[PDB]
DNA sequence: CCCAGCTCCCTGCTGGCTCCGAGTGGGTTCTGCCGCT
DNA sequence: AGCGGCCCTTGTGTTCAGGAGCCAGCAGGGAGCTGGG
């Protein structure tokens, strides 16, 4: 209340950097317990973290010390064991990958080139157009130039997996087709430079390509995924809560299989399952993939579905 | 041996390995049954063409088969109940990983644990010794003894018979004089004391043995009050000034841009140094300049803020805003935070500006 | 069967949905009528900006939040202690109160769950 | 239908069934039975003259 | 079927043969190919001293000559049977010396890495 | 099919016959009670009667030792009973009896009671099975497409839909290609015939065309022959089909085996599924191709999808039959799993413990309660709407609801063509009664005198035809087809005839006399064509 | 959706129209700012529209 | 001093993705269960 | 008694809105260049 009242002059969009997510989150060390309670006591490290908000009516938030109404939700976070592609950003990620090389992580076309200078001058304040034109040019190109002079493979998508397929690989026999991993993509994006990012069109201040890869999954507060006290004492958990529980279980399983030596194959399988779960949580309607099924075969409702269309947050509630 | 292993490396001509899903814990039985079937089938018209079968322990729910063709693996695995799920799909392990598959890796006292069921459930305990052969562990915890039961001289079997409507006793340190007054029999066996078939320590802790399955060894962490009754680490957070006490670059102060575990690998920003260095936790030290806010996360008076008039090598001195008294704390335990001390209450027992009735 | 007695319905600050604080639905629940999209558009045509604001914000789900002026994100505001803090910027003074629909707040939280920064520049 | 539930102003939470808001009438009749699982199960028919 | 272990209990792996059987089976028969040197049969103590109850994994060789995994485990020369992936411990020093006198090299079966 | 297991010991577990009791209800003491339909309504019970069967478990271990035991009246679940039906306890009760039982005599019944809620099954429309419909779809890459939703009399396998399309003009000519079940690619018709075992183009054209004096037909089919020439052997064609299969087997032998299985079982099941049905299958396929050629040349009008005579109404009979078939398959699978797991240890098992009556009972209850016609876990994949709550607002409303009809087209469709009132609906469907909402034209009602056949076995009709001058398809030679009149029975081309007029006269006389042909049977003679189609479908 | 959203109007307005999630994905990826000019944006923010 | 590759680019096609009016009143079923540990 | 898995029967299975338009990827073909003869 004491804070001065203000209107809104603009809304700046972007991607939450994992460090920013960690700083925001009140669930220090992330979340590691799929369970919600502990003998009727909401587990701090569980999904029903009291820090994240007020659980019961007439309670108060452990964080802001506010009752139901006054309390806004406070986020948590989950340190994904392995990097995971963000489904919503997948197409943009593929475009960026085609734009840069694997090794230099540099543009397949130099900024100083007259054509790219022209594109930059033309698409000022139009990062989408800038990205499309630069993507066309890098589609045209196939090597790295002050780069590594290497051969950029073609990127193919298959559901949630990406495949880099080399034609005329640099060496006599190095590799022909590789399942590119989210970790590899994240490393490439981190290696990418800020000026190259701006040329791509992504304002590095507000969106770095590496941020596109999920590493610190945000955790919506209880208010976003409220649990309803039932006529029976058994509280009913939200669909997002169940999906988060599944993701946490897979994450803990993978973390165990890492902390103790486990077959690279089972590690890959856990990574695949975690990727699928996160992708469904974001959007439970990706074609081809199986639909996340709550129980008795009733599909979940992802955030994308919440916001999708009529009867959604935007059209249905705003 | 290593040189010979080089000539023993796999090749295209050599038979391949395929992964097959299987039930959990039945790998040995499945392999033995498979061999009995193949030997029976040796004299038949269709002999199994698979060269070998592997049932590793580090891997669970999976068995590997060495064969010339997948159809050969399928034929070998057919007719096995535990391999019903596996028969639908056979995975081709890559050549590079085949060696890793064959490779195996072969490898605590005074640790805090909890119990699952029983009258001692939800009780923190400390480990004494573990016997894997017997599947039992020894836990020292705070005893739960009912004094009224001793006073009335009830049998343990009777107590268990009528346990349905009887409340469990609380946690309190064992006292021999109390039982002597109550009339119960107390026996002495060296350091330990025998009472009702149980060994009690002189201090008061109860030592008992329980099954590992009953005991909890995962997701267990004691509370500060529990540790008090029973009675390296670093505190580095973003936005804190640290000094490089050891190393070539000494007497340099940088900001904590990142945070990690054993090896923090911070990216400090030193004076007139745009570039960021790399230092581990041990090399990293927490140092602050004069006349600046400081907060103590852990210490004699934790959750306190003050200003430092000096900084000794190991005893930083600050004055608490709460009271005009000196407070010496470890520099590592000290932290820099421009934010004012929140002073949030623990357990939300009382709220700010809340009426209370100290006296009627 | 359709009789006026089974259809008459009215509301003034009744119970509200749990997910979003908007009025409940259906007269059996003492709900509120839906000021739909075409109603919004008709009011836009009328030019009744203030009435539209009342209908969609002040009469449906008025809400208040605190936002860091720097990063433009909702900040923890213990109004009791008047302790307003943004963890990311570690600041406490540059926090602004902002009135918005609870549905808008929920939308922003859901986006940030989708890992988006709908930063909120009060300047 | 005055109904209560035993808790885990004490030891009892109200779970009664009220007449639908804005409605009115007279209780036509009441029937009491046991559902498939022996639980007491009551149906009340209420008539209103329109 | 004799080479196959009789039951999953009292399992042991030879420190030299790298073969897996049960203690009773070891006493009755012993190693398929190690009988002349080990002389396991006829002495229960010899079975204990030559076989350890701690072992990691098992692989069955239907045709060691053409089995690459058998070549990797250096059990290709051995007749087909069930052989452990790795064994724990080492043979007695006296037996090592007798084997050296016999002209047969002794190699530890501890293939598993130690950490 | 009986379930056999191997641990060696082998079991048979064959079912013999069913026995259905009347609606009964048990309290805690185990007392069965006669649930008044009113009692079920009041206590939210389910008006169902327990079901029973006879089971024969024969065991063989060694020396062909038969351990045949029989368990009789094995309870297997409960079946909700449509009120006033034959097996309902109100059947044939006098009006006085109904008044005593507190049941309106005028109440028509025809609905179930699930947990005390009245439910009514809305008849669901669908394309008539075992028929050849030629549709022109210029929108697609096909000038024309013949289609047949073949389906055996009773079969857990759903209808196998086979298409025979003619590629739109534009290498040189137009080619005819068939899409088969379990095949992701079209197949040259000549290739299909050769796989069936017809290499001689003379024989193939004998099957397809019947008057070789028709250069129009014959030239129009030439391009298909040209496309499919290299494959001249049945084995080659079978290998081709196996390769085209969804998961072709590397082995040519296994590819051919898979293709042969697909042809024998998955293609035109109603024509036949047993071996040696190849001649019948080839003749039916040739007839389908002939229909396609006639439609392509305009000699025969395209079939109209909305023409109501080309539709069937799944009443509560077929719908419950489908649900029960799926559920019985599930029960058999579960019993198989249970018995297999126990016999794996050498120990025997109890079929009574193996049986889970809950499968059938709960599945029927859930389906009839939620209207989701299908497995509970496949709620979305199932089609809802069926089994609506009976509308008791008035007697007229109740009657209309009981006589309701539904088109499964889907309310979202904006095509006015299916929604439009059709001429065929005369006297069959009330032209006026229809919801005015989004579902206009899709939901209908039966005209007063309307009536829906429950189906019947065509065996007596086939026997009469055989006694008659009808000539078997295999018996006859291709030449006679041209002038003779084909005879279809539920889509099964059985044979031909030479005096269709007097044959139809005889059939109509028989039906009117109610001698061999029940009233429901329908007989049509397309005089302009040379077909006589007899339908006993439900 | 195409003709309207290809305009340089604003992510919030475009999302309110159609392809909400895709529009917001693009806005986040490119770090673009909605100038809070349009009536739809002001309505969503609950502040007096222009 | 042609010229067959080879690069670049444009056409055209196929295949994939999103949308399909607004509100209203009722009703029922369901939101785990069984095998394994 | 609590955790894990999972039933779509055809492991291989029918249409869970069909249809109407945009947009992306890729095959193909021609224009033009260029290191050999
Ligand atoms: Zn709060
Ligand atoms: Zn490069
Ligand atoms: Zn901030």
Automatic annotation (TrEMBL), chain D:
Signal peptide bounds: none
Cellular compartments annotated: Nucleus
UniProt record similarity statement: Belongs to the RNA polymerase beta chain family.
Function comment: RNA-dependent RNA polymerase that catalyzes the extension of a non-coding RNA (ncRNA) at the 3'-end using the four ribonucleoside triphosphates as substrates. An internal ncRNA sequence near the 3'-end serves as a template in a single-round Pol II-mediated RNA polymerization reaction. May decrease the stability of ncRNAs that repress Pol II-mediated gene transcription. DNA-dependent RNA polymerase catalyzes the transcription of DNA into RNA using the four ribonucleoside triphosphates as substrates.
Protein name (database record): DNA-directed RNA polymerase subunit beta
Organism, scientific name: Sus scrofa domesticus
Residues represented out of the complete protein: 867 to 927 of 1174
TrEMBL record, chain G:
Function of the molecule: DNA-dependent RNA polymerase catalyzes the transcription of DNA into RNA using the four ribonucleoside triphosphates as substrates. RNA-dependent RNA polymerase that catalyzes the extension of a non-coding RNA (ncRNA) at the 3'-end using the four ribonucleoside triphosphates as substrates. An internal ncRNA sequence near the 3'-end serves as a template in a single-round Pol II-mediated RNA polymerization reaction. May decrease the stability of ncRNAs that repress Pol II-mediated gene transcription.
Domain of life: Eukaryota
Protein name: DNA-directed RNA polymerase subunit
Organism: Sus scrofa
Family: Belongs to the RNA polymerase beta' chain family.
Location of the protein in the cell: Chromosome; Cytoplasm; Nucleus
């Amino acid at each position: 209340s004491a804070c001065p009242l203000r209107t809104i002059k603009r809304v700046q969009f972007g991607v939450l950097s994992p460090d920013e997510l960690k700083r925001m989150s009140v669930t220090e060390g992330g979340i590691k317990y799929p369970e919600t309670t502990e003998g009727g006591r909401p587990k701090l490290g569980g999904l029903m973290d009291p820090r994240q908000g007020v659980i019961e009516r007439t309670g108060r938030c452990q964080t802001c010390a506010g009752n139901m109404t006054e309390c806004p939700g406070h986020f948590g976070h989950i340190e994904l064991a392995k990097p995971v592609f963000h489904v919503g950003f997948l197409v943009k990620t593929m475009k960026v990958l085609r734009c840069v090389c694997f090794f230099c992580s540099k543009l397949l076309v130099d900024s100083n080139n007259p054509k790219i200078k022209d594109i930059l001058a033309k698409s000022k304040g139009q990062p989408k157009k800038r990205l499309t034109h630069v993507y066309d040019l890098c589609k045209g190109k196939n090597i790295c130039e002050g780069g590594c002079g290497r051969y950029q493979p073609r990127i193919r998508r298959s559901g949630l997996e990406l495949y880099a397929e080399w034609k005329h690989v640099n060496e006599d026999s190095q590799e022909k087709k590789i399942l590119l991993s989210p970790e590899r993509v994240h490393e490439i994006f981190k290696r990418i430079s800020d000026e190259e990012c701006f040329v791509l069109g992504m304002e590095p201040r507000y969106a770095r390509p590496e941020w596109m890869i999920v590493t610190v999954l945000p955790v919506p507060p209880l208010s976003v995924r409220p649990a309803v006290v039932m006529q029976g004492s058994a509280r009913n958990q939200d669909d997002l809560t169940h999906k988060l529980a599944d993701i946490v279980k897979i994450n803990n399983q993978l973390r165990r299989n890492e902390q103790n030596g486990a077959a690279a194959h089972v590690i890959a399988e856990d990574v695949k399952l975690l990727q699928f779960h996160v992708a469904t949580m974001v959007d439970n309607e990706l074609p081809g993939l199986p639909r996340a099924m709550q129980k008795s075969g009733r599909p979940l409702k992802s955030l994308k579905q919440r916001l999708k269309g009529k009867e959604g947050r935007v059209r249905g509630n705003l | 041996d290593d040189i010979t292993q080089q000539q023993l490396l796999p090749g295209v001509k050599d038979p391949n390995l395929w992964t097959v899903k299987c039930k959990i814990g039945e790998e040995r039985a499945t392999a033995i049954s498979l061999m009995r079937k193949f030997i029976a089938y040796q004299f038949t018209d269709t002999p199994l063409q698979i060269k070998s079968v592997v049932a590793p322990e580090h891997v669970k729910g999976y068995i590997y088969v060495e064969a010339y063709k997948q159809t050969h693996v399928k034929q070998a695995i057919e007719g096995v109940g535990n391999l019903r799920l596996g028969y639908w799909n056979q995975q081709m392990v890559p050549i590079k990983e085949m060696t890793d598959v064959l490779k195996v890796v072969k490898e605590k006292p005074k640790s805090w644990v909890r119990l699952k069921r029983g009258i001692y459930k939800d009780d923190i305990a400390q480990v004494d010794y573990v016997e894997p052969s017997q599947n039992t562990i020894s836990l020292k915890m705070i005893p739960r003894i009912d004094y009224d039961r001793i006073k009335a001289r009830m049998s343990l079997k009777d107590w268990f018979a009528k346990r349905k409507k009887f409340k469990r006793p609380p946690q309190r340190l064992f006292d021999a004089e109390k039982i002597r007054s109550l009339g119960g029999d107390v026996a002495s066996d060296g350091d330990f004391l025998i009472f009702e078939g149980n060994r009690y320590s002189r201090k008061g802790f109860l030592f008992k043995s329980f099954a590992m399955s009953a005991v909890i060894t995962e997701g267990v962490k004691p509370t500060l009050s529990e540790l008090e009754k029973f009675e390296r680490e670093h505190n580095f957070q973003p936005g804190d000034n640290v000094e490089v006490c050891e190393g070539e670059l000494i007497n340099l102060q940088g900001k904590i841009l990142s945070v990690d575990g054993n090896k923090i690998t911070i990216m400090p920003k030193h004076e007139d140094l745009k570039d960021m260095l790399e230092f581990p936790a041990q090399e990293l030290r927490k140092y602050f300049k004069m006349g600046d806010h400081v907060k103590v996360i852990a210490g004699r008076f934790e959750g306190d803020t003050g200003l430092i008039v000096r900084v000794e090598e190991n005893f930083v001195i600050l004055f608490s805003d709460l009271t005009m008294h000196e407070l010496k704390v470890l520099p590592r335990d000290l932290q820099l935070c421009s934010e004012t001390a929140s002073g949030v209450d623990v357990g939300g027992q009382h709220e700010w500006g809340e009426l209370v009735q100290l006296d009627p | 069967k359709h009789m006026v007695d089974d259809k008459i319905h009215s509301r003034a600050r009744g119970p509200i949905q749990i997910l979003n604080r908007q009025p409940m639905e259906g007269r059996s629940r003492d709900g509120g009528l839906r000021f739909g999209e075409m109603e919004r558009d008709c009011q836009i045509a009328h030019g009744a900006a203030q009435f539209l604001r009342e209908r969609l914000f002040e009469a449906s789900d008025p809400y208040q939040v605190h936002v860091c002026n720097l990063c433009g994100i909702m900040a923890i505001a213990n109004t009791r202690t008047h302790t307003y803090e943004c963890r990311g910027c570690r600041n406490k003074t540059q926090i602004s109160l902002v009135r918005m629909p609870y549905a808008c707040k929920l939308l922003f939280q859901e986006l940030m769950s989708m890992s988006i920064a709908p930063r909120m520049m009060s300047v | 239908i005055g109904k209560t539930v035993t808790l885990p102003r004490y030891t009892k939470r109200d779970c009664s069934t009220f007449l639908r808001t804005s409605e009115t009438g007279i209780v036509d009749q009441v029937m009491v039975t046991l559902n498939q699982e022996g639980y007491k199960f009551c149906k009340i028919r209420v008539r209103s003259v329109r | 079927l004799e080479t196959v272990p009789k039951d999953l209990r009292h399992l042991r792996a030879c420190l030299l043969c790298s073969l897996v059987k049960t203690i009773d089976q070891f006493e009755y028969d012993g190693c398929d190919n190690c009988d002349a040197y080990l002389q396991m049969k006829g002495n229960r103590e010899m079975v204990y001293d030559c076989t350890s109850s701690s072992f990691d994994g098992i692989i069955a060789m239907m045709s060691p000559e053409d089995s690459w995994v058998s070549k990797w485990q250096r059990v290709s020369n051995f007749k087909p049977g069930v052989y452990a992936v790795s064994v724990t411990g080492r043979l007695p020093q006296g037996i090592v010396r007798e084997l050296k006198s016999r002209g047969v090299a002794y190699k530890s079966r501890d293939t598993a890495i130690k950490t | 099919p009986p379930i056999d297991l191997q641990a060696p010991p082998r079991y048979l577990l064959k079912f013999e016959q069913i026995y259905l009791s009347k609606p009964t209800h048990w309290e805690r003491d185990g007392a069965p009670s006669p649930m008044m339909p009113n009692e079920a309504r009041l206590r939210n019970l389910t008006y169902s009667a327990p079901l029973y069967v006879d089971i024969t478990k024969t065991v063989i271990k060694e020396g062909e030792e038969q351990l045949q035991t029989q368990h009789q009246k094995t309870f297997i679940g409960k079946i909700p009973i449509m009120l006033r039906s034959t097996y309902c306890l109100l059947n044939g009760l006098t009006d006085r009896d109904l008044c005593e039982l507190n049941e309106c005599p005028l109440d028509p019944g025809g609905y179930f009671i699930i947990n005390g809620s009245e439910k009514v099954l809305i008849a669901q429309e669908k394309m008539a099975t075992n028929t050849v419909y030629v549709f022109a779809k210029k929108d697609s890459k096909y000038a024309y497409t013949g289609e047949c939703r073949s389906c055996l009399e009773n079969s857990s396998r759903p209808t196998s839909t086979i298409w025979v399309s003619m590629l739109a003009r534009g290498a040189i000519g137009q080619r005819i290609v068939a899409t088969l079940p379990y095949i992701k690619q079209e197949v040259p018709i000549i290739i299909v015939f050769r796989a069936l075992g017809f290499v001689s183009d003379r024989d193939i054209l004998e099957h397809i065309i019947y008057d070789f004096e028709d250069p129009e037909m014959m030239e129009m089919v030439k391009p298909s022959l040209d496309e499919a020439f290299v494959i001249q052997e049945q084995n080659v064609a079978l290998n081709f089909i196996g390769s085209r299969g969804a998961k072709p087997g590397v082995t040519k032998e296994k590819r051919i085996k898979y293709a042969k299985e697909v042809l024998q079982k998955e293609m035109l099941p109603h024509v036949g599924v047993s071996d040696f049905c190849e001649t019948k299958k080839a003749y039916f396929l040739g007839y389908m191709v002939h229909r396609l050629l006639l439609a392509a040349l305009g000699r025969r009008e395209l079939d109209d999808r909305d023409h109501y005579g080309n539709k069937r109404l799944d009443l509560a009979g077929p719908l419950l039959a489908f649900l029960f078939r799926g559920m019985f398959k599930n029960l058999l699978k579960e019993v198989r799993i249970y018995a297999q797991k126990f016999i794996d240890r050498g120990k025997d098992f109890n079929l009574e413990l193996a049986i889970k009556t809950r499968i059938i009972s709960d599945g029927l209850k859930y389906s009839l309660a939620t209207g989701n016609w299908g497995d509970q876990k496949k709620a979305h994949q199932a089609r809802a709407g069926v089994s609506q709550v009976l509308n008791r607002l008035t007697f007229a409303s109740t009657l209309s609801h009981l006589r309701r009809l539904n088109s499964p087209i889907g309310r979202d469709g904006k095509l006015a063509k299916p929604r439009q009132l059709h001429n065929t609906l005369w006297g069959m469907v009330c032209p006026a009664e229809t919801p005015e909402g989004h579902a206009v034209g899709l939901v209908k009602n039966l005209a007063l005198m309307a009536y829906i056949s429950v189906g019947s076995q065509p065996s007596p009709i086939l026997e009469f035809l055989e006694e008659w001058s009808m000539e078997n398809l295999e018996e006859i030679s291709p030449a006679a087809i041209a002038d003779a009149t084909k005879i279809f029975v539920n889509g099964c081309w059985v044979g031909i005839h030479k005096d269709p007029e007097q044959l139809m006269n005889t059939l109509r006389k028989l039906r009117r006399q109610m001698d061999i042909i029940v009233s429901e049977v329908s007989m049509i003679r397309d005089i302009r064509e040379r077909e006589i189609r007899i339908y006993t479908d439900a | 959706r195409h003709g309207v959203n290809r305009q340089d109007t604003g992510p919030l307005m475009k999302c309110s129209f159609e392809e909400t999630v895709d529009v917001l994905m693009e806005a986040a990826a490119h770090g673009e700012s909605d100038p809070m000019k349009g009536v739809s944006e002001n309505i969503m923010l609950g502040q007096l529209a222009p």
